[PDB]
């Protein structure tokens, strides 16, 4: 039993856009933009909607780069996250109620203030390799189990 999520990383030659989560689950961490997929929208629709709602940006093209399943101890639903990549954006990123966006040089990604799983799978994203991941959390800090592989088809 899974629930669909989207995660969008704006990745330009020298820099990546991240958003500081301001409230709710995972507040205080930087992450890509995304969230729950709603009924009546494609997964990629959901990804553009979340990217716009949280950063003001729209995009010409989103590219599927990964899928990650998250389990949390004691939580019935799993997160089935579809990860997207884009370089060309439309607009300038602005703060939302949810997310404060900031650019980061690729050698200054704030991994210690990001979700732990990102340290595992961000490198594959940075190499523009497609991947499948699984991460079992206990709470929001401890990864009990994980798998990670490159794929031909996300
Ligand atoms: C906006 O942040 C996310 C959107 C969709 C899925 C996951 C996320 C954020 C917040 C969240 O719930 N989980 C963590 C995030 C990651 O960067 C990868 C998994 C850990």
Curated annotation (Swiss-Prot):
Ligand binding (8-oxo-dGMP): 6, 21, 31, 115-118
Effect of residue 25 to A: Reduces 2-oxo-dATPase and 8-oxo-dGTPase activities
EC code: 3.6.1.56, 3.6.1.-
Tissue expression remark: Widely expressed with highest expression in thymus, testis, embryo and proliferating blood lymphocytes.
Motif (Nudix box): 35-56
Gene3D superfamilies in the record: Nucleoside Triphosphate Pyrophosphohydrolase
Known cofactor(s): Mg(2+)
Residues at which O(6)-methyl-dGMP binds: 6, 21, 31, 115-118
GO molecular function terms attached to this record: 2-hydroxy-ATP hydrolase activity; 2-hydroxy-dATP hydrolase activity; 8-oxo-7,8-dihydrodeoxyguanosine triphosphate pyrophosphatase activity; 8-oxo-7,8-dihydroguanosine triphosphate pyrophosphatase activity; ATP diphosphatase activity; dATP diphosphatase activity; hydrolase activity, acting on acid anhydrides, in phosphorus-containing anhydrides; metal ion binding
Mutagenesis / variant outcome for changing residue 81 to M: Decreased localization to mitochondrion
Subunit structure comment from the entry: Monomer.
Function as written in the Swiss-Prot or TrEMBL entry: Oxidized purine nucleoside triphosphate hydrolase which is a prominent sanitizer of the oxidized nucleotide pool. Catalyzes the hydrolysis of 2-oxo-dATP (2-hydroxy-dATP) into 2-oxo-dAMP. Also has a significant hydrolase activity toward 2-oxo-ATP, 8-oxo-dGTP and 8-oxo-dATP. Through the hydrolysis of oxidized purine nucleoside triphosphates, prevents their incorporation into DNA and the subsequent transversions A:T to C:G and G:C to T:A. Also catalyzes the hydrolysis of methylated purine nucleoside triphosphate preventing their integration into DNA.
The protein, known as: Oxidized purine nucleoside triphosphate hydrolase
């Amino acid at each position: 039993a899974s629930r669909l999520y989207t995660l969008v990383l704006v990745l330009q030659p020298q820099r990546v856009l991240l958003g500081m989560k301001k409230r709710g689950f995972g507040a205080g961490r930087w992450n890509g933009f995304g969230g729950k997929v709603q009924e009546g929208e494609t997964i990629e629709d959901g990804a553009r909607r979340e990217l716009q709602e949280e950063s003001g940006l729209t995009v010409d093209a989103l590219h599927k780069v990964g899928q990650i399943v998250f389990e949390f101890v004691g939580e019935p639903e799993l997160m089935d996250v579809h990860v997207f990549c884009t370089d060309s954006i439309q607009g300038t990123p602005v703060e939302s109620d949810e997310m404060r966006p900031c650019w980061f040089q690729l050698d200054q990604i704030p991994f210690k203030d990001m979700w732990p799983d990102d340290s595992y799978w961000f490198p594959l994203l940075l190499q523009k390799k497609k991947f499948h991941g699984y991460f079992k959390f206990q709470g929001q800090d401890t990864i009990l189990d994980y798998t990670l592989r490159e794929v031909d088809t996300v």
